[PDB]
PDB file of C-alpha atoms in Angstrom:
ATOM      1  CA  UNK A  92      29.737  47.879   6.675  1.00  0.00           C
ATOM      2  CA  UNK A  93      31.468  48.577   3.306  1.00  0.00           C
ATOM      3  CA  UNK A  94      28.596  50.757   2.742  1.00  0.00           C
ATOM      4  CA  UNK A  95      29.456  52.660   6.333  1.00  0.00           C
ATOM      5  CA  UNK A  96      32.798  52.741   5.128  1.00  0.00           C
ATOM      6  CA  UNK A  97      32.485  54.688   1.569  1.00  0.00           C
ATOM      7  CA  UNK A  98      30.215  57.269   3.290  1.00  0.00           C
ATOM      8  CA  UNK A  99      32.914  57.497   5.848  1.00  0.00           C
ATOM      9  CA  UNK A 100      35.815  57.563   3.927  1.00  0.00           C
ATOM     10  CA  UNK A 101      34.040  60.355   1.701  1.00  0.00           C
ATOM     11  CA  UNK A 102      33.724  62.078   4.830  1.00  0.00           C
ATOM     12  CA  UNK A 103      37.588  62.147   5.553  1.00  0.00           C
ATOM     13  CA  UNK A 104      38.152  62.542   2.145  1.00  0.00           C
ATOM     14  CA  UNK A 105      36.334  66.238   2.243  1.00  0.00           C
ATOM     15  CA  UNK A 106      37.829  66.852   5.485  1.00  0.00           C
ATOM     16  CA  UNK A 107      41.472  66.207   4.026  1.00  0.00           C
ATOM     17  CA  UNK A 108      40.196  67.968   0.752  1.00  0.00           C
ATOM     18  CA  UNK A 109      39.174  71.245   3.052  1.00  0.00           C
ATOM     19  CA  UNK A 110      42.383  71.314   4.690  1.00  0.00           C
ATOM     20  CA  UNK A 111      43.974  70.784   1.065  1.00  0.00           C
ATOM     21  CA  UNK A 112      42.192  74.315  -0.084  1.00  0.00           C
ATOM     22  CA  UNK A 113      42.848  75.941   2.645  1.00  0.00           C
ATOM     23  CA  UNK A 114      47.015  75.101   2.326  1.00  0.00           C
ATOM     24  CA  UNK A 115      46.047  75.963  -1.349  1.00  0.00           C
ATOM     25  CA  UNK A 116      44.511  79.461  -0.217  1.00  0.00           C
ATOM     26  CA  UNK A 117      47.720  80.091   1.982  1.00  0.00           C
ATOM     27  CA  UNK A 118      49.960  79.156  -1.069  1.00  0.00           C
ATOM     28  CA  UNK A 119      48.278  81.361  -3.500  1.00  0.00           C
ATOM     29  CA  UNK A 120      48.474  84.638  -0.939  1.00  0.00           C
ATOM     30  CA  UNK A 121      52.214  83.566  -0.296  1.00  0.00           C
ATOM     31  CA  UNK A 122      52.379  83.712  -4.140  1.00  0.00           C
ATOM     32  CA  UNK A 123      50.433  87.119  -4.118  1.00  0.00           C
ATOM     33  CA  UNK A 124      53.014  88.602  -1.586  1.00  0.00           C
ATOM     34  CA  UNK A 125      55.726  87.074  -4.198  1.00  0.00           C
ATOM     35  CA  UNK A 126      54.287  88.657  -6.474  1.00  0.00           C
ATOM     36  CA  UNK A 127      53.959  91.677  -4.225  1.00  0.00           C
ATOM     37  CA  UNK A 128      58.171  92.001  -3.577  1.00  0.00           C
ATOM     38  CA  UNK A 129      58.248  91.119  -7.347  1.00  0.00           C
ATOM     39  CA  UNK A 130      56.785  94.572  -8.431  1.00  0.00           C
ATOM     40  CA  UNK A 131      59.271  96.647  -5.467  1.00  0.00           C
ATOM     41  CA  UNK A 132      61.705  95.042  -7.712  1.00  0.00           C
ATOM     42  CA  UNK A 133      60.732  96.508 -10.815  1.00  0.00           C
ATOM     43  CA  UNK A 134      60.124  99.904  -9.591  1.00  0.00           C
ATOM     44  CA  UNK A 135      62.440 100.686  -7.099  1.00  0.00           C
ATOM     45  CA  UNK A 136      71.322  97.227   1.374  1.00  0.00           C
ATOM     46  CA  UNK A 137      69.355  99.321  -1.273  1.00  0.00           C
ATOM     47  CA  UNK A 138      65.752  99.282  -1.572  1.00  0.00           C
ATOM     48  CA  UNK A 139      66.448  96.710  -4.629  1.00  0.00           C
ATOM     49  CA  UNK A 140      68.590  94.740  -2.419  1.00  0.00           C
ATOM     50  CA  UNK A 141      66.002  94.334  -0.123  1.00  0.00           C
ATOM     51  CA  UNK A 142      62.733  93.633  -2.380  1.00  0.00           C
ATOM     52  CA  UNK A 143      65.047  91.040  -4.023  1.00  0.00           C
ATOM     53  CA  UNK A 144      65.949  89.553  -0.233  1.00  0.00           C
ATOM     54  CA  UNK A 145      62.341  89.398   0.733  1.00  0.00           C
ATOM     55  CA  UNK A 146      61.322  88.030  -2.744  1.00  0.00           C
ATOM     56  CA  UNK A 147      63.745  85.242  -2.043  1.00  0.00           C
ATOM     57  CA  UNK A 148      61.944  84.577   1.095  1.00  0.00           C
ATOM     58  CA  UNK A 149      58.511  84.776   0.217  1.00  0.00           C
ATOM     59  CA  UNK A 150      59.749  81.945  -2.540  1.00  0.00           C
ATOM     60  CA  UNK A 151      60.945  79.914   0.338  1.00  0.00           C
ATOM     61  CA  UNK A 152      57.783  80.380   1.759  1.00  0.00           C
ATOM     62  CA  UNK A 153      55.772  79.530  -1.028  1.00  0.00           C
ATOM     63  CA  UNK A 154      57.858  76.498  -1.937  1.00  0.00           C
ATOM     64  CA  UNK A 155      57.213  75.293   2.068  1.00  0.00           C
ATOM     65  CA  UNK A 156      53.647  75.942   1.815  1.00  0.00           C
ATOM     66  CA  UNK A 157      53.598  73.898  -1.691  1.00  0.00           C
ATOM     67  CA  UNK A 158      55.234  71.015   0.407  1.00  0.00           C
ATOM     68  CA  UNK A 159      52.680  71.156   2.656  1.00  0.00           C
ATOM     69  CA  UNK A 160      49.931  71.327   0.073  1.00  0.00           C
ATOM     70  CA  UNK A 161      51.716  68.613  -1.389  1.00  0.00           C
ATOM     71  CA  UNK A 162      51.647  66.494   2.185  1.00  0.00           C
ATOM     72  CA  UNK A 163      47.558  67.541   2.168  1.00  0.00           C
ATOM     73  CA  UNK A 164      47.449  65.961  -1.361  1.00  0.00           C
ATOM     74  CA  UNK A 165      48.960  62.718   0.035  1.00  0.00           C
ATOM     75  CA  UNK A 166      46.395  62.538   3.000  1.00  0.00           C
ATOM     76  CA  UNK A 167      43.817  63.333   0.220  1.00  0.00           C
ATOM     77  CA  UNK A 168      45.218  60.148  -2.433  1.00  0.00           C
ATOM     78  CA  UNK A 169      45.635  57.800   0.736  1.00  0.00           C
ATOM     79  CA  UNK A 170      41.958  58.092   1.500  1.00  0.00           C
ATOM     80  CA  UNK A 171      40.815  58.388  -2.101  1.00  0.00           C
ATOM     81  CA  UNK A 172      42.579  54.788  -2.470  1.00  0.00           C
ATOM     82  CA  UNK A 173      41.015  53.722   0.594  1.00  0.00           C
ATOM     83  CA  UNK A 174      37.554  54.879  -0.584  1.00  0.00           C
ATOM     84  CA  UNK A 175      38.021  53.104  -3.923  1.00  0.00           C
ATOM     85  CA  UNK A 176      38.980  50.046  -2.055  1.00  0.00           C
ATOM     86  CA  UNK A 177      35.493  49.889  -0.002  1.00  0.00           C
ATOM     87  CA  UNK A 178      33.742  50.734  -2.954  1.00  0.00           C
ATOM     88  CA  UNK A 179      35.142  47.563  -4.996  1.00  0.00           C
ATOM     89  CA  UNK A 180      34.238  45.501  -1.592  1.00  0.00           C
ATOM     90  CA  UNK A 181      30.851  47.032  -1.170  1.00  0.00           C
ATOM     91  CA  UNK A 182      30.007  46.149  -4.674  1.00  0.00           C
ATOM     92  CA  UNK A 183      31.654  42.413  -3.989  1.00  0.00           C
ATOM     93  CA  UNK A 184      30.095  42.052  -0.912  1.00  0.00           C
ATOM     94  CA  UNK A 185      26.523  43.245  -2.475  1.00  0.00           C
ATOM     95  CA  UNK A 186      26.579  40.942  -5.135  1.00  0.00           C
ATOM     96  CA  UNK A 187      27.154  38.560  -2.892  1.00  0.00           C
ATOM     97  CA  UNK A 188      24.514  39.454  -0.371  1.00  0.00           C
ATOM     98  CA  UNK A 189      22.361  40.234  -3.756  1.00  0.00           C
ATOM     99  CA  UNK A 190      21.101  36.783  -4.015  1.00  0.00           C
ATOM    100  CA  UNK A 191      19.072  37.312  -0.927  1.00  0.00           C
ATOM    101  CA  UNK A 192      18.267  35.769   2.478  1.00  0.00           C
ATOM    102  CA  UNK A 193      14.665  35.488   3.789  1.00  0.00           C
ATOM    103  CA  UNK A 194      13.839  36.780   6.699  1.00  0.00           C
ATOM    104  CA  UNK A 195      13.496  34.086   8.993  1.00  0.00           C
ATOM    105  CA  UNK A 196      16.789  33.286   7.779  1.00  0.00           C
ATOM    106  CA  UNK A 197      17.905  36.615   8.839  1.00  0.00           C
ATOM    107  CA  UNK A 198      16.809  36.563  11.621  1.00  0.00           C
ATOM    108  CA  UNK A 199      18.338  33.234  12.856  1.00  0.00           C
ATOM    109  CA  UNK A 200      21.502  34.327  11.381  1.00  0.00           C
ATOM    110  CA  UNK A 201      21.475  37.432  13.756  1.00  0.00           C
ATOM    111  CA  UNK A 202      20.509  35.681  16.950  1.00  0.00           C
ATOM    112  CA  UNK A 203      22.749  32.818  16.050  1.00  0.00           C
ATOM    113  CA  UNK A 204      25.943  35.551  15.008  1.00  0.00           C
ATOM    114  CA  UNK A 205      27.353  39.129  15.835  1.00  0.00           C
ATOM    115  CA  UNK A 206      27.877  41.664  13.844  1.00  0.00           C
ATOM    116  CA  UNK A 207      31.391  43.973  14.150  1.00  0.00           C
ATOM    117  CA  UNK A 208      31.629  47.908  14.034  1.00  0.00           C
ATOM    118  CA  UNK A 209      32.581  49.552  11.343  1.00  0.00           C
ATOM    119  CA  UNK A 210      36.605  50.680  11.888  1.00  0.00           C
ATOM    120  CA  UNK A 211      37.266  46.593  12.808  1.00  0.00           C
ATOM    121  CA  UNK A 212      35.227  45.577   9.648  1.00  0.00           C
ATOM    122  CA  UNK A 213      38.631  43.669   8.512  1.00  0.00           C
ATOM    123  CA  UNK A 214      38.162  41.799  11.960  1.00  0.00           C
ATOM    124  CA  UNK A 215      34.547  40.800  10.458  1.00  0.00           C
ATOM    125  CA  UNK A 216      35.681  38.898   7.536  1.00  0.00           C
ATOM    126  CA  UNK A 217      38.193  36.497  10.109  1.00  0.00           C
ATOM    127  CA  UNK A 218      35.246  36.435  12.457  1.00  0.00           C
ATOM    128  CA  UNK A 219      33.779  34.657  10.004  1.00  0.00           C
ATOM    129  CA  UNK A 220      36.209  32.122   9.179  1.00  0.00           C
ATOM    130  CA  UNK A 221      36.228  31.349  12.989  1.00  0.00           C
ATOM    131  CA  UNK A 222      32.432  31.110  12.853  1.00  0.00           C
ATOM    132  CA  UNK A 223      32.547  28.605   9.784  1.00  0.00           C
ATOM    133  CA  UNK A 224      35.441  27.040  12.160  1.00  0.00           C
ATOM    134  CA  UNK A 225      33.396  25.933  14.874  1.00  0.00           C
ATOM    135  CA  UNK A 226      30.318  25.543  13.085  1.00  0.00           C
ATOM    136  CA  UNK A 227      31.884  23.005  11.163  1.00  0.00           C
ATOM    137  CA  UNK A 228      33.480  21.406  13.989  1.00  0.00           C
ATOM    138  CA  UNK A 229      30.069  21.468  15.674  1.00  0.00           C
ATOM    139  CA  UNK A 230      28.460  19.737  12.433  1.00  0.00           C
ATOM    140  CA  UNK A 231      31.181  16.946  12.246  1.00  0.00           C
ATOM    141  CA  UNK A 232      30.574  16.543  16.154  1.00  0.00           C
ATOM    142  CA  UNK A 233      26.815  15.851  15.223  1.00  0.00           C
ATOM    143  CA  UNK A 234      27.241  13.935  12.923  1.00  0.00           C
ATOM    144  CA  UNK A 235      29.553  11.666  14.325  1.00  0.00           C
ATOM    145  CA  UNK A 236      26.764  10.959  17.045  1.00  0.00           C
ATOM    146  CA  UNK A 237      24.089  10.629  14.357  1.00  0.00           C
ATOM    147  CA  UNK A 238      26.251   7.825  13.249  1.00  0.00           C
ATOM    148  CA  UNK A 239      27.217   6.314  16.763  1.00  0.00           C
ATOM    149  CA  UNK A 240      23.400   6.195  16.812  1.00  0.00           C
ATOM    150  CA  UNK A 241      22.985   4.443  13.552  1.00  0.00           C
ATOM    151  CA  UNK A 242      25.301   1.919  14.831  1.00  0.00           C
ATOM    152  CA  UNK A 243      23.579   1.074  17.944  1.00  0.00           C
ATOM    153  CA  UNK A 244      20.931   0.848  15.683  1.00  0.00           C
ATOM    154  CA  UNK A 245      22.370  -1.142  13.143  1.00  0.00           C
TER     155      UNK A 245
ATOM    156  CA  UNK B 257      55.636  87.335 -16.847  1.00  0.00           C
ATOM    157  CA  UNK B 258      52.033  86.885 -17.099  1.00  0.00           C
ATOM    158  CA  UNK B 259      52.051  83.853 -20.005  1.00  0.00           C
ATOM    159  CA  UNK B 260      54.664  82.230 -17.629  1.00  0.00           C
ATOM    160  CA  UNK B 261      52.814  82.352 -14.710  1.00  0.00           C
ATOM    161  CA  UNK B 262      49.916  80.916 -16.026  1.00  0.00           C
ATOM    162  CA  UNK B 263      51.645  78.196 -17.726  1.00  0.00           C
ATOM    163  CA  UNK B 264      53.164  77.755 -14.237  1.00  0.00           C
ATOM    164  CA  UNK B 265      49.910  76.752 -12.841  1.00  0.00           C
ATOM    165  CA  UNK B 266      49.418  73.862 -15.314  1.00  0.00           C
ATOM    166  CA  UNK B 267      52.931  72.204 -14.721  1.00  0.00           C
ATOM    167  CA  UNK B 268      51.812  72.558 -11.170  1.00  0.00           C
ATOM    168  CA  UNK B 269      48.519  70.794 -11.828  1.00  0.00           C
ATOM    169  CA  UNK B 270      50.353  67.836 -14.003  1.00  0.00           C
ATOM    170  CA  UNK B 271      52.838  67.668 -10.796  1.00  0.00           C
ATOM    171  CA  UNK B 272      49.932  66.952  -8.545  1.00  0.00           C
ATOM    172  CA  UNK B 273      48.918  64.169 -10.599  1.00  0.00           C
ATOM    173  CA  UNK B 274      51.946  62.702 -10.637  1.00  0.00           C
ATOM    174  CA  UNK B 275      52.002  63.332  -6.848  1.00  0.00           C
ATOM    175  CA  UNK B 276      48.959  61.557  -6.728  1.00  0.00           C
ATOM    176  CA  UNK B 277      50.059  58.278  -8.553  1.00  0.00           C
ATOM    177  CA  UNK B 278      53.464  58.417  -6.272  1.00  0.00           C
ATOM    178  CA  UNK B 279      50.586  58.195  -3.153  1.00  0.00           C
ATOM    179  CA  UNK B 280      48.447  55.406  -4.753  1.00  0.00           C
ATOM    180  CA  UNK B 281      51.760  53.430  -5.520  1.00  0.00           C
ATOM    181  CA  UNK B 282      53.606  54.005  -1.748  1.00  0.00           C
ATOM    182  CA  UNK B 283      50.148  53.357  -0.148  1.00  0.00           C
ATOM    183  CA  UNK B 284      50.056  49.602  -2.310  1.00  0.00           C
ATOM    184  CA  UNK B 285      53.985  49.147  -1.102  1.00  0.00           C
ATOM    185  CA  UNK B 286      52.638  49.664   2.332  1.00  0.00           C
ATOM    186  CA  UNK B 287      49.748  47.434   2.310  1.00  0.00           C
ATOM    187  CA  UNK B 288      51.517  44.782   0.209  1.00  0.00           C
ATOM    188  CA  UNK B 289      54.171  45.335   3.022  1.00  0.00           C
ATOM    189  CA  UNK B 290      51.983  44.494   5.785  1.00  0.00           C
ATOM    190  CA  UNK B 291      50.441  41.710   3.837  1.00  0.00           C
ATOM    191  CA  UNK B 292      53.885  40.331   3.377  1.00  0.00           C
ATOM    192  CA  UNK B 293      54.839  40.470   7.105  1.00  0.00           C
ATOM    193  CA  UNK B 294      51.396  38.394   7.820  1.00  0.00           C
ATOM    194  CA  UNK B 295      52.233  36.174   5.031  1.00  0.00           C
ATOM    195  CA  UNK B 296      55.540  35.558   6.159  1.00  0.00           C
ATOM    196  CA  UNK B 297      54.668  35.092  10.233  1.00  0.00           C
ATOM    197  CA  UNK B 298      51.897  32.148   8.771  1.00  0.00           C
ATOM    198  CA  UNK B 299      55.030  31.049   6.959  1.00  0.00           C
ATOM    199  CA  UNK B 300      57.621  30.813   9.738  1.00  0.00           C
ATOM    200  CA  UNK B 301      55.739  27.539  10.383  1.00  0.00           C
ATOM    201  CA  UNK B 302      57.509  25.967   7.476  1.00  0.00           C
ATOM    202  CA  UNK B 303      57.879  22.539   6.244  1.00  0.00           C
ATOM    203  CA  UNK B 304      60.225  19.707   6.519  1.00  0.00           C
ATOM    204  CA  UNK B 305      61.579  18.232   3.095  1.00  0.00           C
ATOM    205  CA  UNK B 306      59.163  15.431   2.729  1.00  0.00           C
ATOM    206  CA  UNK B 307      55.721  18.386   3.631  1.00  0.00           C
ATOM    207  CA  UNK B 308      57.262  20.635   1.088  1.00  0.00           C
ATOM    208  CA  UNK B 309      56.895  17.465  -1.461  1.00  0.00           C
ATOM    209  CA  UNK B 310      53.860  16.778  -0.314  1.00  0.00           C
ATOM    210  CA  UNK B 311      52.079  19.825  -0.447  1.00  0.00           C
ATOM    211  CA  UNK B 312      53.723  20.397  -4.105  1.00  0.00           C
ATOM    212  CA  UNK B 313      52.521  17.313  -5.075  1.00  0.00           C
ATOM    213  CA  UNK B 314      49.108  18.374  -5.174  1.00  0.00           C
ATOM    214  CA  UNK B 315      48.504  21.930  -4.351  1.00  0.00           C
ATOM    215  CA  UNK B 316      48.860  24.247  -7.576  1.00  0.00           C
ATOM    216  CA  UNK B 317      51.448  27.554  -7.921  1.00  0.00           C
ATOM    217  CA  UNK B 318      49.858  30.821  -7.302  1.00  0.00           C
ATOM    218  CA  UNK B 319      50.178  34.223  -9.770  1.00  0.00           C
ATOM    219  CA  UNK B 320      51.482  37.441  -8.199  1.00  0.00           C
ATOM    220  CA  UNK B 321      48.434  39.901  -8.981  1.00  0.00           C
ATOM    221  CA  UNK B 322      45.823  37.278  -7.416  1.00  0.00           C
ATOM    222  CA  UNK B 323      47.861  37.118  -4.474  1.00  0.00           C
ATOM    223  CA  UNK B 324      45.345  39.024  -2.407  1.00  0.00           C
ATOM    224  CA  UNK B 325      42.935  36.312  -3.960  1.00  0.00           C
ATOM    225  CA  UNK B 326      45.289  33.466  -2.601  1.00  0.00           C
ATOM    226  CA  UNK B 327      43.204  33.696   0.196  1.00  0.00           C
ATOM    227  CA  UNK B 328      39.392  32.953  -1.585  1.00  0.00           C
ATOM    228  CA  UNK B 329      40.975  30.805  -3.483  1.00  0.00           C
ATOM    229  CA  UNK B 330      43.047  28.383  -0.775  1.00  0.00           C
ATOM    230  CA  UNK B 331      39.118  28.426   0.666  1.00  0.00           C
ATOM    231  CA  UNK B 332      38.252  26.928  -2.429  1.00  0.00           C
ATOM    232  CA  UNK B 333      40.720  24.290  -2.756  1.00  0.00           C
ATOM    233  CA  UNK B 334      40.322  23.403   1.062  1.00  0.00           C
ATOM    234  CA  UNK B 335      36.660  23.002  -0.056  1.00  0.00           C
ATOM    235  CA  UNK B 336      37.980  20.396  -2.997  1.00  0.00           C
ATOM    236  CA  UNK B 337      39.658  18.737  -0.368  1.00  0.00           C
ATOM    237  CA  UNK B 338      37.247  18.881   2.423  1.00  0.00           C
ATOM    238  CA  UNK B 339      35.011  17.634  -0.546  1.00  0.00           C
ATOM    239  CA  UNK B 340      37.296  14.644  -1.369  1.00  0.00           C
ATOM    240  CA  UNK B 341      37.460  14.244   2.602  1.00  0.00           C
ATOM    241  CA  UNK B 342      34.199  13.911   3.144  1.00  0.00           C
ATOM    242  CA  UNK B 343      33.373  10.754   0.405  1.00  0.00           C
ATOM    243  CA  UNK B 344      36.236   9.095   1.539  1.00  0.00           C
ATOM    244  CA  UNK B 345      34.644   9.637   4.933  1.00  0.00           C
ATOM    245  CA  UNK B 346      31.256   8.219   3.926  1.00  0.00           C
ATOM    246  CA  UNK B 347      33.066   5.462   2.440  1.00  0.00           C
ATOM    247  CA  UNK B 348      34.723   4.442   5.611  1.00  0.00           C
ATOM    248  CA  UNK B 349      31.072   5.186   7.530  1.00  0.00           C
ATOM    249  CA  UNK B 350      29.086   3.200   4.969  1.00  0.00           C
ATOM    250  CA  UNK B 351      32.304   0.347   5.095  1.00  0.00           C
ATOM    251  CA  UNK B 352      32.142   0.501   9.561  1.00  0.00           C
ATOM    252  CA  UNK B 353      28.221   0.136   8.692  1.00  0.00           C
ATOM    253  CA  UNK B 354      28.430  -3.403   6.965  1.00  0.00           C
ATOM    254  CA  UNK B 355      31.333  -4.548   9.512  1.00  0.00           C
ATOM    255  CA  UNK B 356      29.508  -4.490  12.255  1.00  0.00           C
TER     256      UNK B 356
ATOM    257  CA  UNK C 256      54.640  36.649  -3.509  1.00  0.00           C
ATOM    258  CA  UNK C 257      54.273  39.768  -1.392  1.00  0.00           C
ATOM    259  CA  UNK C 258      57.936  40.414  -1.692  1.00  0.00           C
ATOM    260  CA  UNK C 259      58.148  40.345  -5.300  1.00  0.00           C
ATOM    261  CA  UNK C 260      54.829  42.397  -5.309  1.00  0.00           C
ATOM    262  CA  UNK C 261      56.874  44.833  -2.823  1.00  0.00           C
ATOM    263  CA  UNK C 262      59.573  44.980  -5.253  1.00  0.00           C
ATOM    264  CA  UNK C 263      57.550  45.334  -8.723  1.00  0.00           C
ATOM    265  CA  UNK C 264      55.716  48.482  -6.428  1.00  0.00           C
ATOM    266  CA  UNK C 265      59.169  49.654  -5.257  1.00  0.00           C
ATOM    267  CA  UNK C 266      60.136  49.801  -9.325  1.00  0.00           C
ATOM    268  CA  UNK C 267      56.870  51.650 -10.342  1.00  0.00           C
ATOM    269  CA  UNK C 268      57.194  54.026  -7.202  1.00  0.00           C
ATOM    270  CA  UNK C 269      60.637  54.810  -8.578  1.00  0.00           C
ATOM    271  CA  UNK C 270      59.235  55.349 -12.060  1.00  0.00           C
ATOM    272  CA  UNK C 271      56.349  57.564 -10.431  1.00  0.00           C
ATOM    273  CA  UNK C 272      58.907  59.877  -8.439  1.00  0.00           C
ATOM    274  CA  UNK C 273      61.517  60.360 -11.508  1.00  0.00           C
ATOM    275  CA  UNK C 274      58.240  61.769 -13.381  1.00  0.00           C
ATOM    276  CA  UNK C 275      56.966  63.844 -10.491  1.00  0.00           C
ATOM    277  CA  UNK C 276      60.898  65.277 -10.356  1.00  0.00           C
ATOM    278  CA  UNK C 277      60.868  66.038 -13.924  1.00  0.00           C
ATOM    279  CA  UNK C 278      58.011  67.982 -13.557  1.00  0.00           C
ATOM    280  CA  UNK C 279      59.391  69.812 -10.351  1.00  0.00           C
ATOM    281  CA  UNK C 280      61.856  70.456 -12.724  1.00  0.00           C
ATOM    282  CA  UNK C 281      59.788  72.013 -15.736  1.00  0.00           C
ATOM    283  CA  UNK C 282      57.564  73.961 -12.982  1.00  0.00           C
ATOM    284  CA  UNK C 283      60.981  75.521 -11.476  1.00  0.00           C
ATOM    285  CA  UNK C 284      62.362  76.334 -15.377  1.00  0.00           C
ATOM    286  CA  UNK C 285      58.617  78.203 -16.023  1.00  0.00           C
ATOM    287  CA  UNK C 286      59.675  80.235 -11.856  1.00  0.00           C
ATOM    288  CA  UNK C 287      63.097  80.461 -13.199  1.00  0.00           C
ATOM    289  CA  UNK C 288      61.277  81.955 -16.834  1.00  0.00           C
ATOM    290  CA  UNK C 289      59.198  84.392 -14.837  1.00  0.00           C
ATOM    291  CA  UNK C 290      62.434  85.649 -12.857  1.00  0.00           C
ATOM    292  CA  UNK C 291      64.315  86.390 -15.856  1.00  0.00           C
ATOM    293  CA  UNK C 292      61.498  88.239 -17.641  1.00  0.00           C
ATOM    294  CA  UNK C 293      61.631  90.168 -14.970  1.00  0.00           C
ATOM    295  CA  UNK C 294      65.039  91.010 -14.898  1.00  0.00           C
ATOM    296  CA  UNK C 295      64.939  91.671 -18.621  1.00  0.00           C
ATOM    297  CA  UNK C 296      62.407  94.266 -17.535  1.00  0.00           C
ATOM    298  CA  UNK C 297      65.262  96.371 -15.050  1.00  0.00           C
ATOM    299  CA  UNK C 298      67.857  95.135 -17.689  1.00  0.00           C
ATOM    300  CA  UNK C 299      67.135  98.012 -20.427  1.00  0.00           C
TER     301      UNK C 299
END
């Protein structure tokens, strides 16, 4: 599931890196069209006046569309941290799983337990403590009878 | 005009990364928030006076940056003591064994 | 534990954002560089 989860997350990640280039492409043609009312200025109520008005507000504009960018970045770091999260997991959870199970073993442990999807993977790791709960409870209750028995026998 | 624009872009670049690290560190505050609200509804339990002294007497005091590991590692001292448990169990089966 | 972890976070957040302002602040002197170039250029 950890595995799910990095090829996931690097999914969202390019999605939210897309969405970052394209609010980069929008702030680099806002800066062109600064740029653009930059030059009237040099050249030219007065036709200075107003290149130095609409320079002022393609800034504005720019800045906002930085902000933005800036807001895409923060979707962007949020996943990234997420993805670097399941990766240190996966590799946790592979080491662990690394010193194997056969597959008899496997295949008891699958028609003796469930498995959860991949967004409620957190719910997975208390699943199993609940498991190991009643398991154990379930051991202590057999062995309790095992030793009612040996008493009867003794 | 041109120089400073394209020194522009690279203040803009070092921004980011510092934009960046402000992310990583507000998305830890968040999930060592909600960490801290589970922590503290398990906690709301509480103890009397005499179960704080208790569990002090025995259970050992945990370091901030293996607090997530508080968790793996309470599972390993309830092992200890579900260890401990379980011989002083035996003993008592073993001791009900040559009563009867 | 979670608290004081909130708290240490809270400090190095506030580290993080007084960099990322300084640098605001060096990106809008380089803007503010550009504008006054320029200006020197309609100046003469």
């Amino acid at each position: 599931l950890w595995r799910e989860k990095i090829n996931l997350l690097n999914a969202r990640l390019a999605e939210a890196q897309t969405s970052e280039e394209q609010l980069q492409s929008q702030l680099d043609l806002q800066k062109k069209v600064v740029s653009d009312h930059m030059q009237r200025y040099l050249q030219v109520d007065s036709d200075a006046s107003v290149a130095k008005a609409k320079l002022d507000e393609a800034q504005t504009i720019e800045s906002e569309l930085d902000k933005q960018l800036r807001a895409a970045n923060k979707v962007t770091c949020v996943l990234d941290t997420e993805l670097t999260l399941a990766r240190a997991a996966e590799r946790k959870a592979q080491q662990t799983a690394q010193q194997g199970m056969k597959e008899e073993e496997r295949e008891l442990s699958a028609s003796h337990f469930p498995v959860v999807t991949l967004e409620q993977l957190p719910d997975i790791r208390d699943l199993e403590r609940q498991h190991e709960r009643g398991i154990q409870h379930e051991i202590e209750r057999v062995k309790a009878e095992l030793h009612r028995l040996n008493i009867e026998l003794t």
